[PDB]
Symmetry: C4
Subunit: 357 residues, 4 copies
């Protein structure tokens, strides 16, 4: 077997060390634009998010309401594919024809929307999603290091060339990244085991600390870019617990972030808002739960947070403020200048409130 020199680490084990903050860096001047799909050296991506957040490919997260609400703020949603082809295409169509500052739209001013696909019924599902107006697709899987994803991407390329964009994943190391890169993926998703509703141990025991996974994949992605001139955006998927984890993921090299729990708490998520003992909650279940995969996972509740807009603004304002502490006005600048330290196992306590009531 193959072993590694260091153990893997998660986002909670890292902190950012400030860099020189100049007079021109104030939160309002920070640009959070980021590429969504691959491009060549010297070019710009054909699709750029206005904010680095995308909603998870989950029944309890990315419905039509979510897709519209997020696109309005500059991000994009990936309508879940764990439903009939007709039902998914209907949601995509509804988002693209909803209009019949930071909004993410196409040349026709329609909100952009993505859709998840599987390695099984893609020959029928992909055409339907394309006709419905899907702007980008993404193969939804816990282990993207599979010949099945290569086959799926291959079929798409042979039928649509590079006109149809498709992300692939998930992978957690350089080898997995390279395999999907060579396969033709437009963006690669990183993360196995980090999800809030994913209990690795009680399952297959496959995974890797999210921080280590991102750092490793990003190194391989940068090596790949230098070798081929092709820049492939990567997505840190899962493991975001606190707002600063967003800043860390981006600083470590991720172009954008995929979140489930974070968005499930909003009014726009497709789940039911239920009031339990005085506390308004929202349902949240993983795609691996029996409650979903049958149309491996856990079913739960998340505290109601209200409308997406206000929460995203608050989260990103903190990200922007932190970026200025690090001397960065853009994500690429943050990825270049960030100083990231690991924190001791025997600590973390000093970081939070201590010795006070």
């Amino acid at each position: 077997a193959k072993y590694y020199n260091e153990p893997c680490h998660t986002f909670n084990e890292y902190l950012l060390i400030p860099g020189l903050s100049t007079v021109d860096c104030i939160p309002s001047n920070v640009n959070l634009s980021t590429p969504l799909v691959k491009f060549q050296k010297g070019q710009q991506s054909e699709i750029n998010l206005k904010i680095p957040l995308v909603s998870a490919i989950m029944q309890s997260v990315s419905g039509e309401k979510m897709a519209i609400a997020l696109a309005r703020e500059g991000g994009i949603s990936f309508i879940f594919g764990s439903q009939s082809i007709e039902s998914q295409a209907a949601m995509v169509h509804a988002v693209k024809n909803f209009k019949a500052h930071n909004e993410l739209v196409d040349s026709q001013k329609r909100y952009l929307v993505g859709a998840g696909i599987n390695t099984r019924d893609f020959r029928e599902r992909v055409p339907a999603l394309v006709e419905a107006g899907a702007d980008v697709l993404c193969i939804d899987s816990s282990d993207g290091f599979s010949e099945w994803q290569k086959i799926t991407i291959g079929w798409i390329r042979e039928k649509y060339g590079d006109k149809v964009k498709v992300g692939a994943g998930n992978i957690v190391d350089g080898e997995g990244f390279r395999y999907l890169a060579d396969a033709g993926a437009d963006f690669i998703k990183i993360g196995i085991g980090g999800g809030s509703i994913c209990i690795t141990r009680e399952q297959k025991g496959i995974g890797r600390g999210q921080a280590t996974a991102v750092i490793d994949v990003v190194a391989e992605r940068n090596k790949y870019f230098e070798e081929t001139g092709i820049y492939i955006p990567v997505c840190s998927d899962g493991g975001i617990v606190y707002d600063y984890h967003m800043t860390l993921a981006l600083a470590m090299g991720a172009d954008f972030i995929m979140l489930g729990r974070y968005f499930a708490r909003f009014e726009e998520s497709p789940t039911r808002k239920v009031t339990i003992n005085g506390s308004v909650m929202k349902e949240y279940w993983g795609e691996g739960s029996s409650r979903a995969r049958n149309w491996e996972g856990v079913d739960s509740y998340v505290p109601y947070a209200g409308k997406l807009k206000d929460n995203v603004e608050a989260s990103l304002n903190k990200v922007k403020s932190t970026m200025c502490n690090c001397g960065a006005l853009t994500i690429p600048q943050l990825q270049s200048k960030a100083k990231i330290t690991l924190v001791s196992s025997v600590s973390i306590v000093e970081g939070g409130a201590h010795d006070v009531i």
Copy 2:
């Protein structure tokens, strides 16, 4: 004294990183056969289990019912030797003559069964077990790095040559492995302190993290094979808490796994099924407890799990699925291709369900 460069680690500190999964790897095509006794380069073992699981040499685990139930699924039980010679031989005889898909049997279609022996009354116990029809024997001890085991194996070789198979142990490092290998053991058992009912600290303070023990012994076993052309199967004994620990043990190099608690929960274990406050439990005590060694250990209860068959199928289906994630269709292929990472002390939390009710 002699010290080591790194601290020892247990199974809970590791995770598997996926490899390339090909279209031909589906759980149903995975072969879990594995060698039980030593053989020379170019040969196959005289005894191959159909599944890599064997039941512990314990009064509360391996009785005749267990031996039949496990052999039926492809594994083998080691009838406890902590009973009279006549009583143990009777159980072996009963299993071998019970018949008077994955079943593990001899050339006469009779279920295979093993039996534990001690370094004290072997001159009388071994002959009885052989006559009763025992297919394999195993010296039962917490510290197999003993001249007593060499003497026992020597007596068996001098009286039966290589016709009677005998495992030895337990050891936790290369030196212990080599000593028993040179002594003539047919397979060597690994593990001291990892058992669920073994409290190292409150005892002698001897032991080693199970993962480190397996990894070290396997390295020595492979070195031994290259030097002598002799391949000696090794058994990871104890420390299995979750199904994925099985996959890890095998990936680290163990040919098969010995479990106590896992099997004690089944209907076929020889202990009493007792109902406590609405919960059906099964008794489970270690061989070191006063309740047993007198015909150092703890006496306890384990949740009733039902029939062995359904539980083993579920566990192994998960192992097979994980093997496919790692690109392995067989155990030897898994041992060659597995990518195994240690996880941070400051983590493991991200791995399970978090920040959700």
Copy 3:
């Protein structure tokens, strides 16, 4: 991004190993004097504290009463600047004209006092503080690695030359130290995230273990001194939980220590003494709490400790005793001779009371 070879550590992870204690080292012979502002090689600081403790620039800590009480014992307070310019100058004036063994005073025998300033209204606030009689100033910020601090110090130098002393901060590494050193700071404050009422994670995720921060900054400060002949005193700000942490901070190289919670517990702090369920407490809130910054932080209570005098004497007696264990009669000697070890993550338990009721 830039990474580090080792994770950061906090004070609780360290212990001091005794050195040779001579017959002349008794607590009463220990000198705790220390420089407050920069000077050149061969010179002495223009301001030397008689004890290495200064009170935090906080509304709930450094009022006029605190400043007088601390100066009387040899330390200095930094009157909070989170109030009107007129109100702050009034407190400074009151301390300087209060008289109208270890007392810290000027050439006119008046108690010394400091005052915090911000990078916004300094053109008006600084002149007022100078006229009021402020002996030293200090820019109050969580991230001192800013062009704003360079501008502020520059304005002060251009208007007052080196006659007005001004500390800057906070920083946590060599780069931040060097930036403020070159900018002209008279002393540099170290620490981000360590404060008792600062919850890093629930904020920006910026910071560094206090011990590592001090050690790193001190190394850079010593390198700077060797290069330029300029010695810049540094202050360890925040993270002090136990008295021995004071000894550690000083041993690691800090010239003095800034504390908030420690002083808030005293009768002289400007907060209200409230009795809760039989326990007398004192209010304590961070400068980042809404309760303060509006004239990011937490509001709380700290156990009443009584008068400052008796508590400081007790704390420093322990520091002096420990210094003698280390063979040091002065702080510089402690910084040169201290033997400091990190303690295992798997321990710390042996250090406290254990296995006894």
Copy 4:
């Protein structure tokens, strides 16, 4: 300041890995004799304990009854010196004249006994203890790296030559050992902060993990022996929680072990046996508690264990059994052959009972 490459570790972080156990190693053949005072290469110590245990220099542990009970089993007690010179000499006299298999006695068949002394009144206390018949003395201090101990030992040598034996300590590193070795100590005590009733953090913050301290001192002691031909026995004082910690301390190089809590639980300790809510306890307080030092520490209770004899036999039987697992028939052989591993921070759980009720 001086730093170290590795953090310090405690006994709970280590486990012993078995070595070859021969047929001649059974508990009853294990010899636990060990030297108490220094000797030259090729010689034997003038005083050899029959068991490697000595009772702490504490009011709540080593009284006349304890000294007699322990000497009867082969160990020695150090009558506390935190009492009047007359009172301490009386206890020593009573033990030496009490008679007016493994018993530790002098040439006159009288039980051996030790006595603690301080660096203050030794000019009067030492003569009294010598006349009373003390067999060995030991300077009692938390930080033995002091000129005061050198002076004390010097006075003893000048007045009695090498006829009066005197141990010194405590120290935790090679430098401290060497200082006391050159000063003339007959044996050196190791340990600061490990005591069960010693709360390092709430005090001076001085100390070192006991395991690391012993290992380091032993290395220096062996280097010293090779340089001068003088072998100085060392004592591991404090930190023993479990019986196996005894085996570890000895395996790491300590010639004998000093314990407080362990002995306080016995009928022979001088404290009161009190019954609390159905549980018989014994009082136990440190020498640093106000309750003692006035004729820094904690006052507590320890579960009654009964007579010393039966408990010591049980503890040492386990030590002997473990020694045989390691292939050692004597302490020196154990120190030469022991294989000692550190255990992961993320573990230790596997070592104890787990996943069972």
